[PDB]
Amino acid sequence: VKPNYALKFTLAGHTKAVSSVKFSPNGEWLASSSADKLIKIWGAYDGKFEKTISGHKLGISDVAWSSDSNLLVSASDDKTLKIWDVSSGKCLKTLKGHSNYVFCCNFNPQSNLIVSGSFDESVRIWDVKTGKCLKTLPAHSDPVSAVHFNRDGSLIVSSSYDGLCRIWDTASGQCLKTLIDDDNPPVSFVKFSPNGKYILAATLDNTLKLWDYSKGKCLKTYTGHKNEKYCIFANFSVTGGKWIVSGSEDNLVYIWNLQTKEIVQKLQGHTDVVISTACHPTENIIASAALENDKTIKLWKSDC
């Protein structure tokens, strides 16, 4: 009925605000990106610092893992993405084409494509093997805040400050669905549900919404947290109870019951906006990370 997440570790090392944290698909690692231009890798279970990956010329807004846990991609203010060999820390490829900050990135499940979103209002799709841009989508009329592939990589969902969430056919680059709200708040984050049937979209009016995008139907609204300013990550937690997990501008991590929408836990400890949270693929572990007053990542563990 309610989880009992407790703080296990606080991970310090970044020298500016942290921007995103992501667990490796194999569950061994956490990767973090920062405005400090660095990616850092941490042990998921003991919180032990592992290595720093460097090479971007400006801050990084996002990082994402390949399905084999062997590669990372990062999205930077320097207008590029970089693909990294996790093992060696070496930059394999630099993906060039965006004309403004790259804000968000993700690999497909097959890990042969990367999708990116940028302040240049486009979504791009890249070949992992060659580093070539395969498609540029004129996706939105304002910065693209999030991009995510579904369970088999056949669709991309994008979100933007323009107030829209769009679903795209990966192979053709065609927009299959636009979700709209008559009051048109900026959409600050989106991702598919693990089963691929739903999208979870954050808007800058302190709400998260679960949509059946095929039917154009909003099914659940999660409220009570603070989110009017930043592009904060949200998550489905499915290892124990079925929850929704998000950061918040009141410095807390919020956890809701997915079905009932009840807040079941708030995690206190950070001293700035919790910009990013991530859920461990197999264990009931959450990672959270915070902005400039804080600069730390925390690891939390629950029995359910």
């Binding site: 995103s20 405005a35 801050g59 807004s61 996002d62 910065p143 400050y161 900026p186 930043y230």
Partner: peptide
């Protein structure tokens, strides 16, 4: 960009 307010 993510760590500042741009909206």
């Amino acid at each position: 960009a993510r760590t500042k307010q741009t909206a």
